[PDB]
From a paper:
The tripartite signalling system YfiBNR in P. aeruginosa modulates intracellular c-di-GMP levels in response to signals received in the periplasm and is a key regulator of the SCV phenotype. The effector protein YfiN (also known as TpbB or PA1120) is an integral inner membrane protein that functions as a diguanylate cyclase, consisting of a periplasmic PAS domain, a cytoplasmic HAMP domain and a catalytic GGDEF domain. The third component of the YfiBNR signalling system, YfiR, has a key role in the signal transduction process by bridging YfiN in the inner membrane and YfiB in the outer membrane. YfiB can release the repression of YfiN by sequestering YfiR at the outer membrane, which requires both membrane anchoring and peptidoglycan binding by YfiB for full activity.
Crystal structures of the periplasmic domain of YfiB were determined for two different constructs: from residues 27–168 to 1.58 Å resolution, and from residues 59–168 to 1.39 Å resolution. The longer YfiB construct crystallizes with two molecules in an asymmetric unit while the shorter construct crystallizes with only one molecule per asymmetric unit. Analytical ultracentrifugation data confirms that YfiB(27–168) predominantly forms a dimer in solution, while YfiB(59–168) is exclusively a monomer. The structure of YfiB(27–168) is an OmpA-like domain with a core domain consisting of helices α1–3 and a four-stranded anti-parallel β-sheet with topology β1-β4-β2-β3 (following the numbering for the core conserved domain of Pal28). The N-terminal fragment visible from residues 30–53 includes an additional strand β1’ that packs anti-parallel to β1 in the core β-sheet, and helix α1’ that lies parallel to helix α2. The YfiB(27–168) structure reveals a weak asymmetric dimer whose interface buries approximately 421 Å2, or about 5.5% of the total surface area for each monomer, with a solvation free energy gain ΔG of −4.7 kcal mol−1 upon formation of the interface as calculated with PISA29. The predominantly hydrophobic dimer interface is formed by the N-terminal helix α1’ and strand β1’ of each monomer. The interfacing residues are mainly on helix α1’ and include Leu35, Ser36, Ala37, Glu38, Ile40, Ala41 and Gln44, with additional contributions from Phe48, Glu49 and Leu50 on strand β1’ and Trp55 on strand β1. Following superposition, it was evident that the N-terminal region of YfiB clashes considerably with YfiR, thus inhibiting the sequestration of YfiR. The weak dimer observed for YfiB(27–168) may help to suppress its role in YfiR sequestration by maintaining the linker in a folded conformation and thus inhibiting YfiR binding, although further experiments are required to confirm this.
Author numbering:
A (entry chain A): 30 to 168
B (entry chain B): 34 to 167
């Protein structure tokens, strides 16, 4: 399949919103520390507003299908981190639905600690791993 | 203490007078469902109504107390219970309750109302309580 499903107008929005093109599509990893702070799956209220802006920016150029993927670092129990990561992605999904993203077009996954982008030996690396990613397919 | 009009509202809302104040306990299953500390939307709406009923008669100070059963890790259950009480606090602040007048506590498994030896009792113990000091 050619990766020509997105127009330049759509790519431009993805770039401005912080997305980078990766193997599974355009991806923006959002810091869980920023999104949730000390909470479990409840979003900071300011972060809810931030997320709504991103959803609306995407919807304004007809990017109306996303995958939301939750991730953790390697601290704690693996099953718990998987559950936490799924619930965190689901919280983001709720905000995207409220902004108008069609519910049938949102796929939610929790990957727990299984797909790190950084080394878990460092606080910085662990924080980079604690994220919720938005993925927009390029197909 | 509380005025007659305030007591009448608390009684109407289903609060019961206990040693530490008027108390209204709510099921964590109903409040959070499968979530961790994110309230489900219907429960948010129900909590907002309670907050507004209280604020309409100048009940503007509460304690929110989160509880668990004794199943699972003690430390996690305590954090969970504190975070769940904080979620309810956030709803009350959004309704207009002064932030400085809200006390949030997570008791974990330490203060059961029912028998943890039974499933029924463990379920009753998984709750968040709204308390209005008398």
């Amino acid at each position: 399949p050619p990766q020509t499903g997105l127009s330049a107008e759509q790519i431009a929005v993805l770039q401005e919103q912080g997305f980078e093109l990766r193997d599974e599509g355009w991806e923006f990893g959002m810091s869980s520390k920023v999104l949730f702070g000390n909470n479990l799956d409840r979003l900071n209220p300011d972060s809810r507003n931030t997320l709504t802006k991103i959803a609306r920016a995407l919807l304004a150029v007809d990017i109306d299908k996303v995958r939301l993927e939750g991730h953790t670092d390697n601290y704690g129990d693996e099953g718990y981190n998987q559950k936490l990561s799924e619930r965190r992605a689901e919280s983001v999904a709720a905000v995207f639905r409220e902004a108008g993203m069609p519910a049938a077009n949102i796929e939610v996954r929790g990957l727990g600690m299984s797909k790190p982008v950084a080394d878990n030996k460092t606080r910085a690396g662990r924080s980079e791993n604690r994220r919720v990613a938005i993925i927009v397919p390029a197909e």
